[PDB]
Amino acid sequence: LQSVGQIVGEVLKQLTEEKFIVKATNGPRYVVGCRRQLDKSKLKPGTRV
Amino acid sequence: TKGPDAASKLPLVTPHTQCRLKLLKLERIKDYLLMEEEFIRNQEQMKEERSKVDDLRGTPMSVGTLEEIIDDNHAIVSTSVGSEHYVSILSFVDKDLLEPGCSVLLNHKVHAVIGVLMDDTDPLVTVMKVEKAPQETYADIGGLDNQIQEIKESVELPLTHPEYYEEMGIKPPKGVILYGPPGTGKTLLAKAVANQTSATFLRVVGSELIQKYLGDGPKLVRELFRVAEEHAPSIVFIDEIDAIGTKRYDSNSGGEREIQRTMLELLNQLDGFDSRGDVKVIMATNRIETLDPALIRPGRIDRKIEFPLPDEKTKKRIFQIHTSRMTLADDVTLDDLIMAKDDLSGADIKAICTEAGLMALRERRMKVTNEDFKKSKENVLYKTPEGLYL
Amino acid sequence: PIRALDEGDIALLKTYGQSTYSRQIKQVEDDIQQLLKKINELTGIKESDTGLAPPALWDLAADKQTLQSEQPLQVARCTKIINADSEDPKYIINVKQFAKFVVDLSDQVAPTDIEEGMRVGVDRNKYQIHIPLPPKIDPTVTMMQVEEKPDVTYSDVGGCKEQIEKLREVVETPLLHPERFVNLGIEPPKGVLLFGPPGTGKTLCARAVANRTDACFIRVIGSELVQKYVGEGARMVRELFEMARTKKACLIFFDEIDAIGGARFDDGAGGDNEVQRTMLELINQLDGFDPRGNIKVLMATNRPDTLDPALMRPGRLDRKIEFSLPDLEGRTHIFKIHARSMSVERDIRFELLARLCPNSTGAEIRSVCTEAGMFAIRARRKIATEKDFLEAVNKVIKSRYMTYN
Amino acid sequence: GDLVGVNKDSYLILETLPTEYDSRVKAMEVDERPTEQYSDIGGLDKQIQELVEAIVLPMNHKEKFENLGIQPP
Amino acid sequence: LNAKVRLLREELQLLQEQGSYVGEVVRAMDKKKVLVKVHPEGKFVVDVDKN
Ligand SMILES: Nc1ncnc2c1ncn2[C@@H]1O[C@H](COP(=O)(O)OP(=O)(O)OP(=O)(O)O)[C@@H](O)[C@H]1O
Ligand SMILES: Nc1ncnc2c1ncn2[C@@H]1O[C@H](COP(=O)(O)OP(=O)(O)OP(=O)(O)O)[C@@H](O)[C@H]1O
Ligand SMILES: [Mg+2]
Ligand SMILES: [Mg+2]
């Protein structure tokens, strides 16, 4: 009951290590940070997050 | 029945020459204008419940489409984003004036009907009204006496002497099409009508009623004729109508079908099922043969006026009119240019006069001369085998 | 060999051939223009009528009507009552353009008068129902119907006897005298397409039908059926036929139906399949897997060769009628009709004028009569004479046959 | 693919919903069954017989189709 | 230094202030009121400020 859902989006541009352009499905495009433990190189243009 | 919109225009100073009488006339116009300006200034310099009513009215009032008014105090309105709300109606609204589809006003937050905004005319059709009045009187149209007579009988006499027609149970023509070669007075005779008319003039170009989306061209035509009928008497001048109205062939594309649909909407407005107010239509065309018969029909276009290339006396009239304001020399006899049996529109004659003036200025002389006119005639006109006949 | 004007040339041409009043005239004209601008600026902007009622009809304390009854209920359509689970209804709502929701009632004094698809009212924050509403009426289709009968009868339509008889049969006799059809066991046609050269009495006959009929008459604006938002035209035609069925006896009058749908061949018309789709829905409504009821259709068109064969099929358009160019008797009758009201001589030969106007339509003849009157006016004469009518014929019909003597 | 009610804010799947059918889809069914005849369509005996087979026979005599190895399109 | 710091602080304030919509004026109906259509939502009649 205390688990707020996320919003699915797609990576687009692969900015600097800590910056990713992500387009939210049926929504706008943001520049977002990545969770530390999530680890990187698994988020390439088109990847679902 | 809002009433004619007209087109404010100042008086005309009869003496075109630069002399004291013209100065006096212009000074009189100016002094009246100055008195008007000072009167307005003095009015505003010598100058509750409604204020609080407007305060209660929403500050950023929104505009929404009323739909299915209910009860006497509750109606369903639309937010112009597809959503619709079962809103209430304050006592401020007129009531007995709301109709479905009317663009009512809604309080921004509580969304209550608080106004009606019965002026939701689209910008595309508000721009195409005439507020100025071009200074092309009928005295600037050399010749074309028969054409002037026809258009006066169609769009002037029915407003200035509306007894002749009622005295014999005749409805005057509601539609005129001015057709002819490229440049003969077709647009001057609409400019002169606009100048001399007390009716709401509505400029349009056939290439303007066509819209990008689906069903928007017909909607624009319907809106145009709706405003032309609210303001009455009104004249709708569709210049170069062969943009929309060309022959109605069996289309294979989608844009062509939409264009023909716009044309059918225009046809229904011109002569449709229900009726037509005191809106008179003037179309203009270079090539009439390519227009659809349903549009040229003599119920939608009662008069068809040809503007042929001017004959000799008309050409002399054109030269007189367009050299009036020119300091013509006494060496110029404007007959050599007339006699030459070559296609000369009034536009060609005006270009000839302008080029003669420019030739004089090039020669450093402010007074034109016969050699200047000859050179201009040779150098302005841009555009059967020998012996095949005779 | 053409010098270019120097500084002195321009400084002398503006100062040598010159009226001693030219500068003053120019300055005064500029002043007049500026003053006109300033006057327009000060008194500019009227008071756009906002709809306010005359005072003393208002009622302050309506701020309390805005604070109470505040709920600006949205309208929602209950598409599923979730079976009502006996108790604990848990209704579902379908707020259009916004979302679907699972909600309940609230102070609904009649929890039974909810039904499905009853267009309930729903609050903004908590979406509980508050009050039901009557079904939607679609104001566009609502005003499509004709209310004021046009002032055209079956006596201003001259030269159309057989066509008038066929149209009268199909459109009126099944409505006012079903006894003969039921007696003979014939189901009369339900659908007429009036076609002919531009201007022959098609829309005039439609107007006469509208005047004579005592039954619903729906003039369908061919432009109102085309819109953006693919599916909107099909929805409008569906709702139109639904309202027609609601009415006891309906007469639709698609005018200039060449606008709504011709051949269905798309090829490059991928962007014009919406009009074809609404036309297909019209076809389905006209005849498909369902009785159509007491709905009779009129369809006017100049060019019934661009139309879809599926639409022209004689199960939807059953009594195609052609308005041909009137014969000599028809033309004489049209002259008589149109000159009845004119102030004319008492010995004009309208048979002669009908002869002089061959291959001419009723609109053409109307134009001839109008121009005859206009010629009389252009001579300060009160009575239009045979000579004026002949001049009008010459001017309208035509605008050398020495090989056809 | 399933219709579940979900909390507005947290968007958490609360109690599930059985099934939803639009009002139009419910009306999308014959209430009063049409009834005229088969003989009331002339000429296309071949087409009517073929359709009757390929529709009805799989519906009623379903078992024999797979018994004989027929795929009822 | 005071001028530099004040410039930065004022920039901070004016930049953290909320943005503003852009609309097209349909018609300057009435004084102090303007019918303006703001994209993409509907059109309002705004009460213009005194500047
Ligand atoms: N009869 C005329 N009297 C005076 N000027 C004329 C006449 N005919 C043409 N002109 C001149 O032609 C120019 C514009 O012509 P106008 O706009 O009437 O042509 P048009 O027939 O509308 O042409 P188009 O088909 O190219 O639009 C102006 O210089 C106008 O003075
Ligand atoms: N048979 C007729 N009898 C009397 N008047 C007629 C007749 N035919 C045409 N008219 C006159 O012509 C006009 C009627 O035209 P109508 O609206 O019927 O044309 P239409 O055939 O529908 O043409 P379109 O669809 O091509 O615009 C009126 O002026 C009417 O007086
Ligand atoms: Mg022109
Ligand atoms: Mg018609």
Side-chain angles (χ1 to χ4, degrees), chain B residues 73 82 86 153 261 364, chain C residues 3 9 65 73 96 259 378:
Chain B
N73 208 281
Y86 174 83
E153 292 210 85
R261 211 183 334 285
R364 297 289 183 292
Chain C
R3 54 165 176 275
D9 279 19
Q65 183 184 0
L73 286 160
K96 74 154 165 74
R378 199 206 321 261

Side-chain angles (χ1 to χ4, degrees), chain B residues 49-163:
Chain B
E49 302 90 344
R50 204 268 182 169
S51 54
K52 57 172 74 68
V53 175
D54 194 316
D55 291 331
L56 184 60
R57 294 177 65 88
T59 285
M61 294 176 70
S62 75
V63 171
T65 298
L66 179 138
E67 295 183 337
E68 187 182 333
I69 178 154
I70 305 166
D71 206 287
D72 186 75
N73 208 281
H74 289 63
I76 294 148
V77 303
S78 159
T79 300
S80 286
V81 65
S83 78
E84 65 187 0
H85 308 248
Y86 174 83
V87 302
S88 60
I89 298 101
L90 303 204
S91 60
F92 307 148
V93 188
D94 186 74
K95 300 210 195 56
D96 294 332
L97 188 153
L98 294 174
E99 292 93 359
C102 190
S103 278
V104 297
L105 290 164
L106 319 172
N107 189 336
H108 187 221
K109 56 204 74 54
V110 65
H111 271 251
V113 190
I114 50 181
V116 185
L117 183 63
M118 71 285 307
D119 194 345
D120 188 358
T121 308
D122 313 323
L124 304 169
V125 61
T126 302
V127 65
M128 76 179 41
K129 205 174 310 312
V130 169
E131 291 136 20
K132 297 296 289 183
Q135 311 163 7
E136 274 78 352
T137 187
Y138 289 95
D140 303 349
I141 304 179
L144 306 192
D145 291 321
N146 304 310
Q147 291 87 304
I148 279 160
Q149 187 172 47
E150 296 280 340
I151 286 182
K152 274 185 182 181
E153 292 210 85
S154 158
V155 302
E156 298 207 1
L157 269 70
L159 315 182
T160 65
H161 297 91
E163 66 262 55

Side-chain angles (χ1 to χ4, degrees), chain B residues 97-276:
Chain B
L97 188 153
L98 294 174
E99 292 93 359
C102 190
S103 278
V104 297
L105 290 164
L106 319 172
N107 189 336
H108 187 221
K109 56 204 74 54
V110 65
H111 271 251
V113 190
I114 50 181
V116 185
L117 183 63
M118 71 285 307
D119 194 345
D120 188 358
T121 308
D122 313 323
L124 304 169
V125 61
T126 302
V127 65
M128 76 179 41
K129 205 174 310 312
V130 169
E131 291 136 20
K132 297 296 289 183
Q135 311 163 7
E136 274 78 352
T137 187
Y138 289 95
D140 303 349
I141 304 179
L144 306 192
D145 291 321
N146 304 310
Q147 291 87 304
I148 279 160
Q149 187 172 47
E150 296 280 340
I151 286 182
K152 274 185 182 181
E153 292 210 85
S154 158
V155 302
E156 298 207 1
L157 269 70
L159 315 182
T160 65
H161 297 91
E163 66 262 55
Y164 301 144
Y165 306 125
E166 281 75 30
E167 273 204 278
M168 64 183 73
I170 192 179
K171 318 292 279 295
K174 291 259 192 299
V176 188
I177 186 166
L178 285 68
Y179 66 88
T184 45
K186 294 186 288 300
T187 312
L188 293 175
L189 202 52
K191 288 194 221 170
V193 170
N195 183 269
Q196 193 54 299
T197 189
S198 52
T200 296
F201 206 83
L202 274 152
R203 310 165 300 100
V204 187
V205 63
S207 192
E208 166 170 353
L209 308 179
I210 298 294
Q211 302 294 160
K212 186 170 91 74
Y213 293 123
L214 202 70
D216 287 16
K219 182 214 298 174
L220 176 54
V221 170
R222 283 178 45 71
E223 183 69 43
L224 161 57
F225 272 87
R226 170 187 90 66
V227 56
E229 183 178 1
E230 293 179 353
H231 306 96
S234 67
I235 302 154
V236 192
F237 169 67
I238 321 180
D239 208 35
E240 293 179 353
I241 189 168
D242 64 85
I244 69 175
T246 312
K247 281 281 210 306
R248 187 157 80 269
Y249 64 110
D250 190 339
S251 161
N252 184 307
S253 181
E256 176 60 14
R257 275 193 162 118
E258 181 58 22
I259 293 175
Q260 298 182 133
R261 211 183 334 285
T262 306
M263 174 195 154
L264 280 71
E265 183 40 65
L266 174 60
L267 293 178
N268 183 267
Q269 289 303 299
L270 287 173
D271 190 339
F273 171 92
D274 45 15
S275 176
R276 198 157 146 225

Side-chain angles (χ1 to χ4, degrees), chain C residues 237-346:
Chain C
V237 59
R238 269 196 279 277
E239 192 275 9
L240 171 64
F241 267 85
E242 201 296 310
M243 159 188 174
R245 276 194 261 289
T246 288
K247 298 293 181 191
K248 55 205 70 62
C250 185
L251 272 73
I252 289 163
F253 170 48
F254 297 99
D255 195 358
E256 300 153 359
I257 190 167
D258 181 23
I260 301 299
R264 267 179 288 168
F265 200 64
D266 54 349
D267 185 282
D272 186 68
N273 300 61
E274 168 51 22
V275 176
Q276 290 175 5
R277 210 154 300 125
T278 176
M279 181 255 298
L280 279 157
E281 183 55 29
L282 169 65
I283 277 161
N284 173 16
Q285 288 290 292
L286 286 162
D287 187 328
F289 204 104
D290 265 343
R292 197 176 63 194
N294 221 18
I295 297 176
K296 292 149 196 313
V297 180
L298 286 64
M299 301 215 168
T301 194
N302 302 336
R303 284 176 58 67
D305 59 7
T306 71
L307 283 168
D308 202 7
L311 185 58
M312 293 179 72
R313 181 197 102 204
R316 296 136 179 161
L317 293 168
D318 304 338
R319 174 54 80 71
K320 290 172 187 55
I321 287 162
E322 195 190 6
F323 282 89
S324 43
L325 309 190
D327 63 358
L328 186 72
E329 302 312 330
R331 283 194 304 260
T332 299
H333 194 229
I334 297 159
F335 273 80
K336 280 190 198 305
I337 287 306
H338 279 144
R340 207 170 41 209
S341 306
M342 280 189 68
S343 88
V344 294
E345 277 175 342
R346 204 60 71 212

